[PDB]
Amino acid sequence: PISYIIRKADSVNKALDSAVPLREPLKIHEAMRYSLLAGGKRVRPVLCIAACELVGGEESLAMPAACAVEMIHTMSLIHDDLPCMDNDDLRRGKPTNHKVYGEDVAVLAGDALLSFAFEHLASATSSEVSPARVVRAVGELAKAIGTEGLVAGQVVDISLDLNNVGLEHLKFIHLHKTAALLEASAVLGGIIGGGSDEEIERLRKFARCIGLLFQVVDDILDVTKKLTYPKLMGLEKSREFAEKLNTEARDQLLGFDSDKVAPLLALANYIANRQN
């Protein structure tokens, strides 16, 4: 439950602190840490860890990979927040990177977090993991985040007959800007933990489903307290869609070890039933 996530999130925080220490050049490291070590919920690295354990791995095996996906998540925010893109002065209720360090330092801090993600995944992953698996991890991670994946979502996310193309655009953006990196987290965990190719594909589909589910539920909450699921399919159909995503995510975990699969089932039904 929230306890599993809170506790794994805490171990991730400590790992991130350790992975990117303050050293020379100091400013750049401060700027990287400012953003990396802020208050993310850490869902991506925790899903990574969870996926590793689901397949019989241990948290320690996946921890470098988990840190990499969070570094990549962090760098995406840093760049998205720049004036030339979303122009966010605030995120997490705090000044954004470029507001504290300048746009220049913010771009560089994102660049160094992207590259270090790969350095860390490649260099810090235990030698018990077969290098073929680490190569695959590198490739999955890069693919998930470039032009087929995340960046595609960002270039599309610009704001048309919404009745002809609105739903298609909405699913596209969410699949690309949310599901893609959650898919990479789960896939990297499965890969690094020794999962079969079948197991990896079930984890990929699970992650896609809970990625869409997060956004559908967020939209329902927003109206029961921009283009949205309630606007484009109505609220009832939005609720039916979230329930079908919850079911589908659960169905993907059919066939895994009964005890091992609880934290993922708990995460699906938690995301699904968010009250706040």
Ligand X SMILES: CC(C)=CCC/C(C)=C/CC/C(C)=C/CC/C(C)=C/COP(=O)(O)OP(=O)(O)O
Please name the amino acid found at residue 177.
Answer: K
Using the rule CB under 6 A, is 117 a contact of ligand X? no
Which residue in 177, 202, 204, 250 binds ligand X (CB under 6 A)? 177
Q: Which residues of 151-181 are buried (b: 16+ CB within 10 A; e: fewer)?
A: ebbbeebeeeeeeeebeebbeebbbbbbbbb
239 is in an annotated binding site: no
Chain breaks in the chain (C to N over 2.5 A) after: 159, 225
**Nearest-approach distance from CB 149 to ligand X, in angstroms:** 8
How far apart CA 113 and CA 180 sit, in angstroms, is 18
Q: Which residue has the tokens 């995340």?
A: 150
How far apart CA 226 and CA 92 sit, in angstroms, is 20
Structure token pair of residue 159 = 């704001």
Using the rule CB under 6 A, is 88 a contact of ligand X? no
List the x/- string, 10-49, binding to ligand X by CB under 6 A: ------------------------------xx-x------
Structure token pair of residue 194 = 């020794």
Using the rule CB under 6 A, is 263 a contact of ligand X? no
How far apart CA 44 and CA 67 sit, in angstroms, is 9
Using the rule CB under 6 A, is 108 a contact of ligand X? no
Using the rule CB under 6 A, is 151 a contact of ligand X? yes
Contacts of 50 (CB under 8 A, 6+ apart): 4, 8, 186, 189, 263, 264, 267
41 is in an annotated binding site: yes
**Nearest-approach distance from CB 91 to ligand X, in angstroms:** 7
**Closest residue to ligand X, based on beta-carbon distance:** 40
How far apart CA 171 and CA 19 sit, in angstroms, is 35
Q: Which is nearer to ligand X, 91 or 260 (CB)?
A: 91
**Nearest-approach distance from CB 107 to ligand X, in angstroms:** 11
8-state DSSP, 89? S
Using the rule CB under 6 A, is 80 a contact of ligand X? yes
**Nearest-approach distance from CB 118 to ligand X, in angstroms:** 11
Interface of this chain with ligand X, residues 178 to 207, rule: CB under 6 A:
178
Using the rule CB under 6 A, is 238 a contact of ligand X? no
Binding residue positions for isopentenyl diphosphate: 41, 44, 73, 92
Binding residue positions: 41, 44, 73, 80, 86, 91-92, 177-178, 215, 226
Binding residues vs ligand X (CB under 6 A): 40-41, 43, 72, 76-77, 79-80, 92, 145-146, 150-151, 154, 177-178
